[PDB]
Amino acid sequence: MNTDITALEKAQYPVVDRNPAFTKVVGNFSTLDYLRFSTITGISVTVGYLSGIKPGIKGPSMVTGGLIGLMGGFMYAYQNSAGRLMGFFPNDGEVASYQKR
């Protein structure tokens, strides 16, 4: 299947890697990325718990909310990391690590 990563709007920052691999983007996760991940997951677990009290399923509701939050937070962190590696988001740390390795 022929592919093309080229975006409509060009990256406004140094392009460290045009099409970074999945594991490379995951390994690029920063402290802020983990903070976003953890915040989304914790809020989602909390909403699951609180909305589960009335039907009596606070634990299962907690697991469901936590799964939704885990998927959403991982997707958000991946979004940010890959955008930094691709030059779409401000990527000072990516460029500093790239110019050295």
Partner: peptide, 29 residues
């Protein structure tokens, strides 16, 4: 002496994690 409801304790941990994480999120952006 001890809070027994485990699911309540995990929910408390999640709420604390969310609060500390939001504070860190502001502090690092």
């Amino acid at each position: 002496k001890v809070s027994e409801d485990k699911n309540r304790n995990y929910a408390v941990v999640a709420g604390v994690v969310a609060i500390v994480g939001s504070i860190g999120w502001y502090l690092k952006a």
